[PDB]
Design a binder for this molecule. Structure first.
Ligand SMILES: O=C(Cn1cc(Cc2ccccc2)c2cc(Br)ccc21)NO
Ligand SMILES: [Zn+2]
Ligand SMILES: [Zn+2]
Ligand SMILES: [Zn+2]
Ligand SMILES: [Zn+2]
Ligand SMILES: [Zn+2]
Ligand SMILES: [Zn+2]
Ligand SMILES: [Zn+2]
Ligand SMILES: [Zn+2]
Ligand SMILES: [Zn+2]
Length: 203
């Protein structure tokens, strides 16, 4: 099955393991994982983080044929399980110095969910995209500005975390995949660029 191919020790995830818009797996509600994790679930989560690290490394991305990315969900690999990975790098200053922290967010999350959020909405100014989608899709993807999430790590430890700004937007995009929701479902149907008053537009 797909899981067997992905967790082979020598196998690296690349664009060929990523399913396409139209595949029914992307519209299911993914199945909760149970703890303690199987070996396959543990390995999958590590290969997903490895994919993101490779995607962000100019050379490995070139070698493997990948573009830069900050989030991945197991449904996109044809695995209907509530596992996501997020990797959001901080940026160099104007003199070229590395940031104090390499990443503003770095996690493999099992069974994540939004437990509360702000009344205010937000959206990225430049819209969103998706590895499973090979269409230009314009518009503002309207999300919760701020969220409190819960999730479990690979050991089974529960975490509760508040997020805002770009990290909020990323985590929301990945949780949507495990609920069978696509980014363009949150784009206004008649004017993609419509702005209801009070929308926070992120730059
Ligand atoms: O397909 C992907 C990778 N990806 C590709 C574009 C993108 C935008 C946001 Br916001 C989050 C993730 C994104 N994640 O599910
Ligand atoms: Zn592969
Ligand atoms: Zn169940
Ligand atoms: Zn391990
Ligand atoms: Zn590597
Ligand atoms: Zn609500
Ligand atoms: Zn996505
Ligand atoms: Zn919500
Ligand atoms: Zn709770
Ligand atoms: Zn639409």
């Amino acid at each position: 099955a797909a899981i067997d191919k992905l967790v082979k020790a020598s196998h690296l995830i690349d664009m060929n393991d990523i399913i396409r818009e139209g595949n029914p797996t992307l519209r299911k509600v993914a199945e909760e994982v149970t703890f303690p994790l199987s070996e396959k679930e543990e390995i999958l989560g590590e290969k997903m983080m490895q994919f993101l690290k490779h995607s962000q490394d100019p050379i490995m991305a070139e070698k493997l044929g990948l573009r830069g990315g900050v989030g991945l969900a197991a449904p996109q690999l044809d695995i209907s399980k509530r596992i996501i990975a997020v990797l959001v790098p901080n940026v160099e200053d104007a003199q070229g110095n590395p940031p104090k922290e390499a990443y503003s967010l770095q996690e493999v999350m099992y069974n994540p969910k939004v437990v509360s959020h702000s009344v205010q909405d937000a959206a990225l100014s430049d819209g969103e995209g998706c590895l499973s989608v090979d269409r230009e899709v314009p518009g503002y993807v309207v999300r919760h500005a701020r969220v409190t999430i819960e999730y479990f790590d690979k050991t089974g430890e529960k975490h509760r975390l508040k997020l805002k700004g770009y990290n909020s937007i990323v985590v929301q995009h990945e949780i949507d995949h495990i609920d069978g929701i696509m980014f363009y479902d949150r784009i206004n149907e008649k004017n993609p660029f419509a702005v209801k008053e009070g929308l926070l537009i992120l730059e």
